[PDB]
Structure 1
């Protein structure tokens, strides 16, 4: 029942949400586990970079941003061909390669 100018709201608590409540008491343990796994991988690849393969320069769609530059999925085949790098050898050397990227500009 409304009472003297309250906001009209519709809580989405009509299902059995208490059975599907997801707690986060394992967040610090999960962070510790991820940190340990990352350190283990870094020790596994002793001279290789911890982050991993190189990522290309990529711009953003959705003109909302239109200016930000981020890391790409992988280097394009035309880029590899211009640089004189074989696509299969790039994977073994540590260059991220994806075969779906286009090159308009």
Structure 2
């Protein structure tokens, strides 16, 4: 079966694969079906945005992605508490709530609190009964300039701010970057073996 120089291949076709083969001949019709479903959903919630509630800014877990951010599931109960929003009233005005998410730092906590205070500034709350507004209801002059928002509410963008150019000091020139990394690995590797000698 083998021949002159080649690659040892691994064809995973030793089962009855032809019995289970999914073709994508309905992919164009699926694109129209989802597009049509979004148009029907938009008419259902006519003033409300078609995307849905507001998603918070979250930091991706792993080292491969902990530099960028994305849209999470919902705002933490601590962020709702800091922004002065009740956990149950938030879902009525289109705010996603995630009772599971934690806040280990104040950088991510204040990131969404600002995002959550900014969304409530753009809210146009219609009255429960149009013939009698209430305290939380917006004024009739503001209800006229109320259109359905298309796309995600407050798209999460990460605009990179430039580090200001500065004259290099002698302390930065004398800093040994390679020596500080090799010694950091040794001090973190020999930390336990030195802690026993101290006893």
Shorter-chain TM-score bucket reads: over 0.9
Pick the structure with more strand per residue.
1
For structure 2, list consecutive stretches of 5 or more residues without a partner in the other structure.
Answer: 106-199
* Partner residue in 2 for 1:103: 103
Aligned residues: 105
Query: What's the secondary structure of 2:7's corresponding residue?
Result: coil
List per-residue Cα deviations over 1:52-91 (Å, max 9, x = no partner): 1001010110111111110010000000001110000000
Shift of residue 50 of structure 1?
1.1
Which runs of structure 2 are paired with 1:55-66 in the superposition (5 Å)?
55-66=55-66
Query: What's the secondary structure of 1:70's corresponding residue?
Result: strand
* Partner residue in 1 for 2:2: 2
Query: What's the secondary structure of 2:58's corresponding residue?
Result: strand
* Partner residue in 1 for 2:88: 88
TM-align CA RMSD: 0.6
* Partner residue in 2 for 1:50: 50
Q: 1:65 & 1:37 partners in 2: Cα distance?
A: 33
* Partner residue in 1 for 2:155: none
Pick the structure with more helix per residue.
2
Which runs of structure 2 are paired with 1:11-22 in the superposition (5 Å)?
11-22=11-22
Q: 2:27 & 2:10 partners in 1: Cα distance?
A: 30
* Partner residue in 1 for 2:156: none
Q: Mark the structure with the bigger radius of gyration.
A: 2
Query: What's the secondary structure of 1:21's corresponding residue?
Result: coil
* Partner residue in 1 for 2:28: 28
| TM-score w.r.t. length of structure 2 | 0.52
| TM-score w.r.t. length of structure 1 | 0.98
